[PDB]
PDB file of C-alpha atoms (C1' of nucleotides) in Angstrom:
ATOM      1  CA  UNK A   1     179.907 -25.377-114.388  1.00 26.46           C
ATOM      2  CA  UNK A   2     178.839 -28.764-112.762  1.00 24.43           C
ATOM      3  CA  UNK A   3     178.758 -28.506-109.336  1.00 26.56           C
ATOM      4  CA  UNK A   4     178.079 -31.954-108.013  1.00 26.07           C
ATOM      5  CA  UNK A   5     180.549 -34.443-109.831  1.00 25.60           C
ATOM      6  CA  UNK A   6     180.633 -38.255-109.741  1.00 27.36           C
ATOM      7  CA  UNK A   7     183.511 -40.725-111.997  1.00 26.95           C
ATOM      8  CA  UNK A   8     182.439 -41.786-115.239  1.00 27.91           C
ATOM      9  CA  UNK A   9     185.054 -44.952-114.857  1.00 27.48           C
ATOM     10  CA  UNK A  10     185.448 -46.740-112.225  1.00 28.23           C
ATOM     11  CA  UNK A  11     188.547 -46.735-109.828  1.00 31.44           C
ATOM     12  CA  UNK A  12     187.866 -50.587-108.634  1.00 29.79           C
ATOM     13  CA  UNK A  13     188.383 -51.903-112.259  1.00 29.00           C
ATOM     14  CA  UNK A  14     175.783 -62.694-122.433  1.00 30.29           C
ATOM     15  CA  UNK A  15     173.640 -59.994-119.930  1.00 31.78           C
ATOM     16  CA  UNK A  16     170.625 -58.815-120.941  1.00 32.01           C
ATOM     17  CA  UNK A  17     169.391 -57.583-117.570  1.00 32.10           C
ATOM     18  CA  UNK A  18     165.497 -56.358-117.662  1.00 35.68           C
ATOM     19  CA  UNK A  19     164.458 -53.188-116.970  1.00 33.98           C
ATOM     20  CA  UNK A  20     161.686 -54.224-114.047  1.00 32.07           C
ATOM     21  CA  UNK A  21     164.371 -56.134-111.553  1.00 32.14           C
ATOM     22  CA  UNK A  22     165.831 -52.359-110.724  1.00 36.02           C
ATOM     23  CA  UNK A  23     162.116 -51.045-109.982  1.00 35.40           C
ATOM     24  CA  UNK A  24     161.065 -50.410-106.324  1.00 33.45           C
ATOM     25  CA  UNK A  25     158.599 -52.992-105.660  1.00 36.03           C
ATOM     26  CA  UNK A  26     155.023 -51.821-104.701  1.00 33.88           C
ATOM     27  CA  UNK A  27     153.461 -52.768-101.219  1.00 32.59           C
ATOM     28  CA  UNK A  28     151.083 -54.906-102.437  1.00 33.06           C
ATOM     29  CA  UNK A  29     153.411 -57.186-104.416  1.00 31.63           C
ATOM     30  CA  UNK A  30     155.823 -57.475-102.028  1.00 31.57           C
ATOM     31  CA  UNK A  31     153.000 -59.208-100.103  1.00 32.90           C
ATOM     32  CA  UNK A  32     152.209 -61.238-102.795  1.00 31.39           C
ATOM     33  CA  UNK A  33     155.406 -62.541-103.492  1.00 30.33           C
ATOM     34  CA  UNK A  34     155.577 -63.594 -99.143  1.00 30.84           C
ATOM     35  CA  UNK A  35     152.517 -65.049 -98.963  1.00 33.26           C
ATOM     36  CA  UNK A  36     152.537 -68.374 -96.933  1.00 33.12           C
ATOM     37  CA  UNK A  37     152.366 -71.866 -98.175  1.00 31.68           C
ATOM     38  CA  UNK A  38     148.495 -72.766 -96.290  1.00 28.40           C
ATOM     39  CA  UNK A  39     147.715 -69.119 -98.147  1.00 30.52           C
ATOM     40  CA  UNK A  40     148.471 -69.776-101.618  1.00 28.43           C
ATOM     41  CA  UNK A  41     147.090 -73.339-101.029  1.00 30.26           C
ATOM     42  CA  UNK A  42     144.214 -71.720 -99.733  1.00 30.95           C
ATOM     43  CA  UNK A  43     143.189 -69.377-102.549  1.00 29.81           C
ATOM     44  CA  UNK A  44     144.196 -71.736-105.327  1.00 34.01           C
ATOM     45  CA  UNK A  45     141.649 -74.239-104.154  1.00 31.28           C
ATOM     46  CA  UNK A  46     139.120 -71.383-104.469  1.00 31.67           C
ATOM     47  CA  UNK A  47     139.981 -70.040-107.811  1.00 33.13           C
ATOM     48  CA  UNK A  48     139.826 -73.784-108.933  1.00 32.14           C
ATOM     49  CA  UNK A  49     136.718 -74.580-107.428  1.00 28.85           C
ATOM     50  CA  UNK A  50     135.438 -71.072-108.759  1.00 28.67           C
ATOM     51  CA  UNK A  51     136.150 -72.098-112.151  1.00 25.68           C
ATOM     52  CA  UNK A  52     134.379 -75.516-111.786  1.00 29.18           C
ATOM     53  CA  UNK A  53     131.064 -73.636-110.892  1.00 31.81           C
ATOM     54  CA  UNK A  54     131.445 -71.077-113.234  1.00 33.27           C
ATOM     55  CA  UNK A  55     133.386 -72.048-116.324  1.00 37.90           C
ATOM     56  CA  UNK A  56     137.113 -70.741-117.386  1.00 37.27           C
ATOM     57  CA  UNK A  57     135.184 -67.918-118.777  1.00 35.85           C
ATOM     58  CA  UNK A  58     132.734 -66.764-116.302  1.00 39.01           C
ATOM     59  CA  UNK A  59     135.090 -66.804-113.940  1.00 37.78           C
ATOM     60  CA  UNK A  60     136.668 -64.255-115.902  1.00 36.79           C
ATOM     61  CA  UNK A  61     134.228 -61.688-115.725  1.00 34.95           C
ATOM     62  CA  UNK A  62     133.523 -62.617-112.212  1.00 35.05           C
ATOM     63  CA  UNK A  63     136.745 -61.224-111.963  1.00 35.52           C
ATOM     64  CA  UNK A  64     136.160 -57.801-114.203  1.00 33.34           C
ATOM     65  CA  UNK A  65     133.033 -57.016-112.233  1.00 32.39           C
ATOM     66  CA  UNK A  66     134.777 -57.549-108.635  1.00 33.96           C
ATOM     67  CA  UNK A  67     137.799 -55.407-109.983  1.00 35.86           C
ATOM     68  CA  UNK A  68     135.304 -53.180-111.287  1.00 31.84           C
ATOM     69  CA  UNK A  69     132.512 -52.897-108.019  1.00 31.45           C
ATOM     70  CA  UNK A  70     135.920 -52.207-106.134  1.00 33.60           C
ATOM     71  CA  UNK A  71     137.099 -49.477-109.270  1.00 36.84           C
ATOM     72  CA  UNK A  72     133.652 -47.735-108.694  1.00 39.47           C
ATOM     73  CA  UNK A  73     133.713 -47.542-104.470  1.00 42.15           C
ATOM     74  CA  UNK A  74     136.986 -46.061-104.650  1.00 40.12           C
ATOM     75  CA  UNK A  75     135.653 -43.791-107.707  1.00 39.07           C
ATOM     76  CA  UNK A  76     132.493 -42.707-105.678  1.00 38.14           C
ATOM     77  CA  UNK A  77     135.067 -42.092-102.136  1.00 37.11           C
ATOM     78  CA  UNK A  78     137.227 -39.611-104.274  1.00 38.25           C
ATOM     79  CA  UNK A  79     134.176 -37.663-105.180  1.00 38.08           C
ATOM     80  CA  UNK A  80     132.788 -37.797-101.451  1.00 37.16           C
ATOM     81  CA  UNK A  81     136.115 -36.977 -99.757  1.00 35.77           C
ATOM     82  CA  UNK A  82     137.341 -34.176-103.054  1.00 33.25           C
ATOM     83  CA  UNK A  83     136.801 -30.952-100.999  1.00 30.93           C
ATOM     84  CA  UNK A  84     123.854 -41.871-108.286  1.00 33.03           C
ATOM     85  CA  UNK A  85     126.477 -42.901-105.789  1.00 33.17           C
ATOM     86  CA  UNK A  86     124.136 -43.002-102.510  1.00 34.94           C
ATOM     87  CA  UNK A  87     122.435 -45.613-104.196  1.00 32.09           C
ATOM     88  CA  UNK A  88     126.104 -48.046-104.335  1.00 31.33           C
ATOM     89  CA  UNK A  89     124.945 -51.151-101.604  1.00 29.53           C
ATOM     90  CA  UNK A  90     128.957 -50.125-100.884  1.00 33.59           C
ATOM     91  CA  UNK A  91     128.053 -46.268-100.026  1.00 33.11           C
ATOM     92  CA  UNK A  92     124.789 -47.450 -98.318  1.00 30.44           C
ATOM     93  CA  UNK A  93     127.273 -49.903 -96.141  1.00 26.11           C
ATOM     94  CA  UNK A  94     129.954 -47.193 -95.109  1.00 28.30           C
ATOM     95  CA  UNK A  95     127.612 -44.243 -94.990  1.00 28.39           C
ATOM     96  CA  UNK A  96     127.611 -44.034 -91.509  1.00 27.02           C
ATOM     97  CA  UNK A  97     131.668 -44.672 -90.920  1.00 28.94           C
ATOM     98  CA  UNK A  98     131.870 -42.072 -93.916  1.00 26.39           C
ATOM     99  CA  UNK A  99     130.128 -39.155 -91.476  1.00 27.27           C
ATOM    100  CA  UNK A 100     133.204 -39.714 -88.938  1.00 24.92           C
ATOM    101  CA  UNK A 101     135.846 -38.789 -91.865  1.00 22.25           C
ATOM    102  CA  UNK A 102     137.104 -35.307 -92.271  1.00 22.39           C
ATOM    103  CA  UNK A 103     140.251 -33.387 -92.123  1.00 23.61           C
ATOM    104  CA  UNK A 104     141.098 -35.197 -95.380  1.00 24.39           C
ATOM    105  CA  UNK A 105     145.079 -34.671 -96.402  1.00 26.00           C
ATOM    106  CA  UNK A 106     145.718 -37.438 -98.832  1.00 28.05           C
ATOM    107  CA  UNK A 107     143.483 -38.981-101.832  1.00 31.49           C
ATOM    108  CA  UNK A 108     144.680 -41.736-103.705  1.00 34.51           C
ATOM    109  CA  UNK A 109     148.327 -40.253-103.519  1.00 39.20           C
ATOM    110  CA  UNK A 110     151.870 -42.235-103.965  1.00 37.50           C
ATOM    111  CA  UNK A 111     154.101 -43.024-101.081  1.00 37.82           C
ATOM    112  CA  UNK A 112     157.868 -44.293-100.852  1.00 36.31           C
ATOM    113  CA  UNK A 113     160.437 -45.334 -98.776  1.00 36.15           C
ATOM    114  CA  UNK A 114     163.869 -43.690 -99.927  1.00 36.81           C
ATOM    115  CA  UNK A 115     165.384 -46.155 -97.060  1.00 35.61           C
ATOM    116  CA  UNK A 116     163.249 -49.128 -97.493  1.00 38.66           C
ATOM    117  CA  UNK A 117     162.848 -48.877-100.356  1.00 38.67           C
ATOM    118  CA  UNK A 118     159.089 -49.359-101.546  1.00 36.95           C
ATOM    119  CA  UNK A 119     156.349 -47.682-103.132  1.00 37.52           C
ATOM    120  CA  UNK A 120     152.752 -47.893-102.482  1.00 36.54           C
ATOM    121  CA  UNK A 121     149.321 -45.912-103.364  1.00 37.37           C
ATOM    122  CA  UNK A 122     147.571 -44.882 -99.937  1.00 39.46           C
ATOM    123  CA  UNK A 123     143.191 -44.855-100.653  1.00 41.16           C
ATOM    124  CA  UNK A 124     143.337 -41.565 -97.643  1.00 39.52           C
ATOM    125  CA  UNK A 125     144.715 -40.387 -94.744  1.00 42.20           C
ATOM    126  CA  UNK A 126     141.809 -38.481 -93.157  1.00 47.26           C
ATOM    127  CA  UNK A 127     140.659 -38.157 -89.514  1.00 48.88           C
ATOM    128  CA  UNK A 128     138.502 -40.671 -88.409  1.00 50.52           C
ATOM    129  CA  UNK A 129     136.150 -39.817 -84.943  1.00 52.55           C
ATOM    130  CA  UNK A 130     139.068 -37.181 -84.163  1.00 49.33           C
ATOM    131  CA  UNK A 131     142.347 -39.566 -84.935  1.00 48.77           C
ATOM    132  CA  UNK A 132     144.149 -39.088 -87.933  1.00 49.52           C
ATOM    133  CA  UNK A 133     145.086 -42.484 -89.841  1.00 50.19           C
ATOM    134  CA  UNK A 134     145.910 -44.384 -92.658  1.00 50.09           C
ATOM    135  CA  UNK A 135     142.388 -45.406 -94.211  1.00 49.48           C
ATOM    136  CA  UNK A 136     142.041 -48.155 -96.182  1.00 52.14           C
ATOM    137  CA  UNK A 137     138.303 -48.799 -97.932  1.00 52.59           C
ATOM    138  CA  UNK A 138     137.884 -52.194 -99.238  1.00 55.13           C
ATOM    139  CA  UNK A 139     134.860 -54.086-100.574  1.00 57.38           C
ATOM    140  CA  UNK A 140     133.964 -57.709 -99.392  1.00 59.56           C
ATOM    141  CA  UNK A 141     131.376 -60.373-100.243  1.00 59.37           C
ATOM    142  CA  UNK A 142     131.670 -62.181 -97.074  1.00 59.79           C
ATOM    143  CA  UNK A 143     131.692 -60.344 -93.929  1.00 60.54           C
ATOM    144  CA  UNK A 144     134.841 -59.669 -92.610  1.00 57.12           C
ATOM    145  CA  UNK A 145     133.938 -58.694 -88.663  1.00 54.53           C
ATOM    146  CA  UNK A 146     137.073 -59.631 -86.952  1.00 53.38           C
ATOM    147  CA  UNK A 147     140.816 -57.468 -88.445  1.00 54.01           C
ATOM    148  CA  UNK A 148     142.077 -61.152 -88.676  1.00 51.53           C
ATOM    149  CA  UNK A 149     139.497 -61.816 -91.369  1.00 57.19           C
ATOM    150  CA  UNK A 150     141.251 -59.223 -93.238  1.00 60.82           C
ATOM    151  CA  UNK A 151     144.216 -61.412 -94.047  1.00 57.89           C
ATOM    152  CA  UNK A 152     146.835 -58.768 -95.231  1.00 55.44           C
ATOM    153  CA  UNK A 153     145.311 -55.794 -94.827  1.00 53.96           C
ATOM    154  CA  UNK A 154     146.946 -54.571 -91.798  1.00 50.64           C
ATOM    155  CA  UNK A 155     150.260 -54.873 -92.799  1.00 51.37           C
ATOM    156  CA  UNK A 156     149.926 -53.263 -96.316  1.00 52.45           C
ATOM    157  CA  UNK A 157     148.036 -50.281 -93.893  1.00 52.76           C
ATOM    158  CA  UNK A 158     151.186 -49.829 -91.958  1.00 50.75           C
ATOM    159  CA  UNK A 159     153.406 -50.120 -95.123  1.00 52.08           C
ATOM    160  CA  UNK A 160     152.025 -47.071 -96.016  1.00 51.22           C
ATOM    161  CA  UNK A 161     152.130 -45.414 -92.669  1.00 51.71           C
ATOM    162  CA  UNK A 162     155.635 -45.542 -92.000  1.00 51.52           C
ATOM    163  CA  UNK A 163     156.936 -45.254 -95.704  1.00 50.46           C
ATOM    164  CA  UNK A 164     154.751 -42.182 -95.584  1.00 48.87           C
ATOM    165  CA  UNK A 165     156.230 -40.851 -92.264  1.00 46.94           C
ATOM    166  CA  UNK A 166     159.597 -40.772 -94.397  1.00 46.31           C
ATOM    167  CA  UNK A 167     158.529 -39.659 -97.716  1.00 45.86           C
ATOM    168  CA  UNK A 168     159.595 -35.921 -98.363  1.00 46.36           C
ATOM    169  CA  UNK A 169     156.459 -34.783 -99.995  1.00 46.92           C
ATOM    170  CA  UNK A 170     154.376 -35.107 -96.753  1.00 47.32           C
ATOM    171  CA  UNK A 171     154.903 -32.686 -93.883  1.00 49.35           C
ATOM    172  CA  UNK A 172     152.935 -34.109 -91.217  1.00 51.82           C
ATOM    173  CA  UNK A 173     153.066 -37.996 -89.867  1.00 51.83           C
ATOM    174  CA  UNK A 174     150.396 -40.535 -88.839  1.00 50.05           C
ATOM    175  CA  UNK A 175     150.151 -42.843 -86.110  1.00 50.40           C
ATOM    176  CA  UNK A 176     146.744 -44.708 -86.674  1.00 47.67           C
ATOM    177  CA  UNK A 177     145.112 -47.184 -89.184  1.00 47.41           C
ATOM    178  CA  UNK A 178     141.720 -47.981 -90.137  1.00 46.20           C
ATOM    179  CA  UNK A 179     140.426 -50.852 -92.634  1.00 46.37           C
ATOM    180  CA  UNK A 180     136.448 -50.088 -93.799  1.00 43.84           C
ATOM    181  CA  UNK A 181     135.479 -53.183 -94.913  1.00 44.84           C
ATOM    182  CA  UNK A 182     132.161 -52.391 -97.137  1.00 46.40           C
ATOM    183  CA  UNK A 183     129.436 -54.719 -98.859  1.00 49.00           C
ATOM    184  CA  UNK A 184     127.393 -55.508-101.480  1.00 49.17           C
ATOM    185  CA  UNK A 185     124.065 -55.659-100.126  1.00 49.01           C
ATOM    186  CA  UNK A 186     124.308 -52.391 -98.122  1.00 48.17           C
ATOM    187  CA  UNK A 187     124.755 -53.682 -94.571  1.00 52.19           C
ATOM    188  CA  UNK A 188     126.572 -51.777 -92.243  1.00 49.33           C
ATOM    189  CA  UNK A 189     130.820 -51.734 -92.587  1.00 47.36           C
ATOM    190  CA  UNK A 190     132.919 -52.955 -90.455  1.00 46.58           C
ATOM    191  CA  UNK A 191     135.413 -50.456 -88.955  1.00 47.26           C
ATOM    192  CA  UNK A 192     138.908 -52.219 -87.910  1.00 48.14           C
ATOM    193  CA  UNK A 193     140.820 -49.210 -86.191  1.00 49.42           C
ATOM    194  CA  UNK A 194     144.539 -49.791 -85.080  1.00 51.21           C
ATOM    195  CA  UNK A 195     146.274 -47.224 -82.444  1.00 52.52           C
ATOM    196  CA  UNK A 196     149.810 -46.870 -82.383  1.00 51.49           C
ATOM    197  CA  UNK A 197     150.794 -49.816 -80.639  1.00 53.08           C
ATOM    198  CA  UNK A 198     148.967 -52.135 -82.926  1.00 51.23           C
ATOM    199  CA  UNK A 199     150.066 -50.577 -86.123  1.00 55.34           C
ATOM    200  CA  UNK A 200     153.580 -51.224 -84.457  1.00 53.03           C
ATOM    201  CA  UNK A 201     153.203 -54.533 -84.155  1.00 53.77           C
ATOM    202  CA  UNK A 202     151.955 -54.947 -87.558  1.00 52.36           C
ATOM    203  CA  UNK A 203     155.024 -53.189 -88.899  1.00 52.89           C
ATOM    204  CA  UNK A 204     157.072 -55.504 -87.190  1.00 56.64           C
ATOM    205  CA  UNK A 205     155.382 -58.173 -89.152  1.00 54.13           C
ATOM    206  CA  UNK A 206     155.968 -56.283 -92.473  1.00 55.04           C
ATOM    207  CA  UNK A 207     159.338 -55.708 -92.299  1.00 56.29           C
ATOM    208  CA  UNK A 208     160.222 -60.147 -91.440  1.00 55.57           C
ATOM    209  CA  UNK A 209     157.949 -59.682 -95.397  1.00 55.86           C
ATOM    210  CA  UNK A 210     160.066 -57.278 -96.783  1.00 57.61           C
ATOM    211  CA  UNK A 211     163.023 -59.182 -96.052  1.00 57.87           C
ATOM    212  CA  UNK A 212     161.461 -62.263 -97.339  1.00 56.17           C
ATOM    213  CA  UNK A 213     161.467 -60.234-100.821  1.00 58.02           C
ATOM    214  CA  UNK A 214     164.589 -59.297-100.842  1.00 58.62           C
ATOM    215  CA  UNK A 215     165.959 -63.050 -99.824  1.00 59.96           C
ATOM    216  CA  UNK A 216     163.725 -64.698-102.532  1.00 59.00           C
ATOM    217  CA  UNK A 217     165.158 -62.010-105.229  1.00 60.43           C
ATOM    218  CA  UNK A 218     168.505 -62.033-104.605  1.00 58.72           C
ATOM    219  CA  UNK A 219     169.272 -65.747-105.060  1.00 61.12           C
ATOM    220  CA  UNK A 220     165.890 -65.804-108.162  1.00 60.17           C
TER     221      UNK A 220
ATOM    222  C1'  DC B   1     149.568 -50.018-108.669  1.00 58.29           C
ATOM    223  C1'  DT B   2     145.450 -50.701-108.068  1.00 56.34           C
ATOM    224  C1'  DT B   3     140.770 -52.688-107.860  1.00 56.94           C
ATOM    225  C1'  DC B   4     139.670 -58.603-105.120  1.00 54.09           C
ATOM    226  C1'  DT B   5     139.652 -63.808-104.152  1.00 55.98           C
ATOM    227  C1'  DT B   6     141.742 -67.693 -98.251  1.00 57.27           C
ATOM    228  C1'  DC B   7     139.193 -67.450 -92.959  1.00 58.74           C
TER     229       DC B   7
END
DNA sequence: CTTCTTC
């Protein structure tokens, strides 16, 4: 009856293995797990000089409501971009980028790399004034005007472009990006747009920090 | 996994 038959035994001959170091590693982790000794440095001296300001506690729901104002944009861009929430300072900020987005053909949907091997969860791949790209909304306190004051965010754009370019569930490819960086008090976004050379050079510098991963986990 | 925090 079988038709496709592998070897129960195996012709070539305390564990307690866990379940998590077989999983495909997400996009963002992978990043997380590369980041560079001045960046770690760098964000440690902020989360310790947040707590000074703040307490060990209310810099714990400084936390919540940041996850949360970030839970809500992306709540209130589903509903916009599904086929009061103009009162968000974020919506106010990206209301004008938002009236360049159509041609939607992804929401909040899982990619993965069967070569790669990675997963990640793309915000929307719509068409942005005519080019179709990888969109990627984020909030931001501090303006963020330049693409190089959004640390990361290019690379984990392009992570998803090309793992989506491979993943069987999607029939078309994409050869742009675009990070929206959007803010509290309602001032205008910032639109950083990459064309298809930049997104390639990018994905050069996302592959030297996938095989960072796999170098610090095989020896770990 | 995300949602963010470095500059």
């Amino acid at each position: 009856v079988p038709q496709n038959w592998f070897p129960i035994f195996n012709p070539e001959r305390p564990l307690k293995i866990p379940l998590q170091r077989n999983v495909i590693p997400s996009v963002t982790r992978v990043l997380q797990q590369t980041m560079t000794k001045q960046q770690v440095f760098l964000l440690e001296r902020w989360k310790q000089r947040m707590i000074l300001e703040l307490g060990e506690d209310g810099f714990k729901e400084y936390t919540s409501n940041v996850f949360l104002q970030g839970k809500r944009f992306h709540e209130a861009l589903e509903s916009i971009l599904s086929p009061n929430l103009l009162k968000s300072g974020y919506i106010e900020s990206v209301q004008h980028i938002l009236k360049d987005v159509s041609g939607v053909r992804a929401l909040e949907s899982a990619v993965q790399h069967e070569t790669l091997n990675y997963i990640g969860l793309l915000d929307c791949v719509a068409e942005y004034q005519g080019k179709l790209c990888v969109i990627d909304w984020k909030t931001s306190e501090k303006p963020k005007p330049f693409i190089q004051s959004t640390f990361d965010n290019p690379l984990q754009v392009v992570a998803y472009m090309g793992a989506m370019n491979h993943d069987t569930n999607y029939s078309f490819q994409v050869q742009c990006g675009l990070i929206v960086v959007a803010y509290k008090d309602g001032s205008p976004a910032h639109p950083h747009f990459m064309d298809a050379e930049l997104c390639s050079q990018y994905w050069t510098k996302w592959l030297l920090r996938l095989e960072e991963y796999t170098e610090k986990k095989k020896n770990q």
